[PDB]
Amino acid sequence: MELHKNDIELKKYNIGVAISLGNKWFSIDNIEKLVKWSLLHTKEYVIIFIADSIKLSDSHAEEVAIRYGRNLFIKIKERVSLSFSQDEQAKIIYATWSDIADSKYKEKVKYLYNLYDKNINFKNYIENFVKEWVSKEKRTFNNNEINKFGRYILEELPELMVQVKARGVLFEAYVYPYKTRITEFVGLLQKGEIFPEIKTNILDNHPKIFLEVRE
């Protein structure tokens, strides 16, 4: 389990652990190893959060948090309390959707929602985006569901792009085991190489760092 550079060996940043809920790779064992790696390399804290999940709430991420994210965090806490010392455990923050999506955050999501509604090229790009995943799965989806899926992506985009606080703790970098279409898209957005109005409106010269860490 290592990083696929000297700022990490110099422990410059706090490190988020981005979890894809229900993705086959994110067994409790693999999550535990990502947490182990992050604790060894972090400036101080490790922030565990749910990055995606590919009517009890107006927000999809919030509904994921309450139906499933809480039971996931509980299992992670238990495993951690058996695997790590008490001093290590104290450095872990379990950041729920609520912890992350404060007032500043939701403004950035709202800018993206408004762009999704008013810019046909953005909408079409984000929707096409969703169809690539669903064309891998065996299940099929209709348009209204593809369109809603695209909105759920936008809710989570800022926490992969902008340095946000979780319970007042800034994390400048996060770990994820593989490059995805999402991480590629984010990297283009942060450089202004795609939909440059997004960088202009909600991004801020302090880009979140993506660390590719796996076995």
Author numbering: 1 to 4, 11 to 60, 70 to 230
Authors' own words:
Cyclodipeptide synthases (CDPSs) use aminoacylated tRNA (aa-tRNA) substrates to form peptide bonds between two amino acids yielding a cyclic dipeptide product (CDP). ParaCDPS from Parabacteroides sp. 20_3 (GenBank: EFK64745.1) produces cyclo(His-Phe)8 whilst ParcuCDPS from Parcubacteria bacterium RAAC4_OD1_1 (GenBank: ETB63777.1) can synthesise both cyclo(His-Glu) and cyclo(His-Pro)9. ParcuCDPS belongs to the XYP sub-group of the CDPS family, characterised by the presence of 3 residues: X40 where X is a non-conserved residue, Y202, and P203 (numbering respective to AlbC). ParcuCDPS displays a Rossman-fold common throughout the CDPS family.
Inspired by HisRS and histidine recognition more generally, and by the only high resolution structure of a CDPS with a ligand bound, we systematically altered three unique residues in ParcuCDPS P1, which we hypothesised to be participating in crucial interactions with the polar side chain of histidine. We first designed Generation 1 containing seven P1 mutants (Y55F; Y55V; E174A; E174H; E174L; Y189F and Y189L), and these variants were cloned, expressed in E.coli, purified and used for activity assays. By mutating the P1 residues, the activity of the variants was vastly reduced with E174A and E174H incapable of tolerating histidine as a substrate. The impact of mutating Y55 carries more weight than Y189, suggesting it may directly interact with the histidine residue via a H-bond rather than adding to the polar surface. A similar pattern of residues interacting with the imidazole from histidine is seen in HisRS, in which two tyrosine and a glutamate residue mediate interactions with the nitrogen groups of histidine. Further investigation into the changes imposed by these mutants was performed by solving the crystal structures of a select few mutants containing changes to the active site or the pocket residues. The mutant structures were able to be solved using WT as a model and retained an equivalent fold to ParcuCDPS (Supplementary Notes 4 and 7 relating to Supplementary Figs. 13 and 14). Therefore, the disruption of activity is caused exclusively by the change in these few residues which appear important for the enzyme to produce a CDP.
